[PDB]
Amino acid sequence: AENLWVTVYYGVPVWKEAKTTLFCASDARAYEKEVHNVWATHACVPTDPSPQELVLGNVTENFNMWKNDMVDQMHEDIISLWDQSLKPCVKLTPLCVTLICSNATVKNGTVEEMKNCSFNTTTEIRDKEKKEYALFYKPDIVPLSETNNTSEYRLINCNTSACTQACPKVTFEPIPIHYCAPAGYAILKCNDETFNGTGPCSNVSTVQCTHGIRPVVSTQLLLNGSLAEKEIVIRSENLTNNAKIIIVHLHTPVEIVCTRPNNNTRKSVRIGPGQTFYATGDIIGDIKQAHCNISEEKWNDTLQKVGIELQKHFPNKTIKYNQSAGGDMEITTHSFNCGGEFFYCNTSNLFNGTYNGTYITITLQCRIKQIINMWQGVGRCMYAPPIAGNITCRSNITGLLLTRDGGTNSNETETFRPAGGDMRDNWRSELYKYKVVKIEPLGVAPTRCKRRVVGRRRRRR
């Protein structure tokens, strides 16, 4: 015990948990095009070359990925950005006209899917109309009931909600985005890659901004993600819970090549006074339907490694992977966006086979859709214009999304299904390393010092 007097110091580093509205910063010269990009703001101009870093000395702090509010913030961010960039674009409502359709004859053959549809449209003067035609490359157009004619089809936007096409003047991209906290807050980053979702981390390092996040969306599979450096990681709210989800990051990427061999031709249609409508006019090449290629020699080993990783948590239970569960078309199929189109794939062989872990070219047939509800699956409905020429995508798969089955199965067996989820869950696999904390310069701490005495100037005391 000693005689002490209260003392103020502050300007101290001390933090606590908090919530904020963060600032965004895009990488490199992407900010120049960011004015006319969506999934990029208007515009996250980078004021500094992020991310600067320091390793904190002997600091250990709690983390949590599921309660993490940054994903909850960025969901609202991306949805608002999407709707507001789509808002001023040309509406497509007056196309909803009785479509007469037939087999889409093509050069030296007949195409497999689409229908050649011709319909009445409004010319420049509203009192007259003409017989235009377009090739909607989906069979998904609904045939109108209440008629014995087997050909009077309807566009399915008008069944439930009007739609708006995406302006080609603005192009969506997976531009990397860095988050930087505003003044007064710091973003703590964990660096221990063994971190399995929740618990302490004892190599905490502060950063001015987050590393490269990109908002790319894909169900049943992650594309262009970030890999756990050492081993294949498994994360879940609680594995023993039959519900919830299991997120997996791979140790090595496996190249996915996807392409659209049909040589589409872009066509214009004059729906209204200044409103221009884009549609696939004619096919000027051979037909093979869209497809994807994945090398078996990598994927078969990747599944076995993830299998033994699963069996670590599930002792002596053999693992079966199996076909997608069911339900909607956006999660029974592998969805991924590329180059202006939207691809849907059946997962022909990305599910099958049993692999115990202890060791006791694949082709995917893919359909394409123009009209999409957003992957949140309630509100806005678009029209995505066709892209001229064949399309080619090259991307690195990095993580899988799984959900568990059961159970009254014989206790040595277990089954896993590839099933997607929210838009949030895809980004949460990349945003698991961060917190947000407010720096609080605290109040009073004891000191050897004594009273000031008439505000005296003095030396050491």
Binding site: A1, E2, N3, L4, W5, V6, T7, V8, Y9, Y10, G11, V12, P13, V14, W15, T20, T21, L22, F23, C24, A25, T41, H42, C44, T47, Q52, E53, L54, L56, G57, N58, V59, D77, S80, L81, Q84, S85, P88, C180, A181, P182, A183, G184, T206, Q208, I439, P441, L442, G443, V444, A445, P446, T447, R448, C449, K450, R451, R452, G455, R461
Partner: protein, 136 residues
């Protein structure tokens, strides 16, 4: 660090250091708390509803330092003896073991009480600096 030197991301290492080092080079937080890094859409309103909150918090802290008799001083003693119940009454030989972040819990509950004593530590000076007796 010693002297000042350092950066925000050159001084924040004190957050786990013994409090002796943190009692030196305590400056860069003040330089950091103000501005830092920072058709209408989500980019726009965030620069206003966030920046103004930071400025508001900074003015709150500066005002609270102003009232107590600690304006413009990084370090400031006051006239309040430390009551034994609030913490160790011999921290001069114990803060060399404790960092600020872990220290904060030990006085989180009693923080609100102590401002009520710094206020009278100020207003006694207020009473003293006025009246009749001290002719010059």
């Amino acid at each position: 660090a010693v002297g000042i030197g350092a950066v925000f991301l050159g001084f924040l290492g004190a957050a786990g250091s013994t409090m002796g080092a943190a009692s030196m080079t305590l400056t860069v937080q003040a330089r950091n708390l103000l501005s830092g890094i920072v058709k209408l859409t989500v980019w726009g309103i965030k620069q206003l509803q966030a920046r103004v909150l930071a400025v508001e918090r900074y003015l709150r802290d500066q005002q609270l330092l102003g009232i107590w008799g600690c304006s413009g001083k990084l370090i400031c003693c006051t006239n309040v003896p430390w009551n034994s119940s609030w913490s160790n009454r011999n921290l001069s030989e114990i803060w060399d073991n404790m960092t600020w972040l872990q220290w904060d819990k030990e006085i989180s509950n009693y923080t609100q009480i102590i401002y009520g004593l710094l206020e009278e530590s100020q207003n006694q000076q207020e009473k003293n600096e006025q009246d009749l007796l001290a002719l010059d």
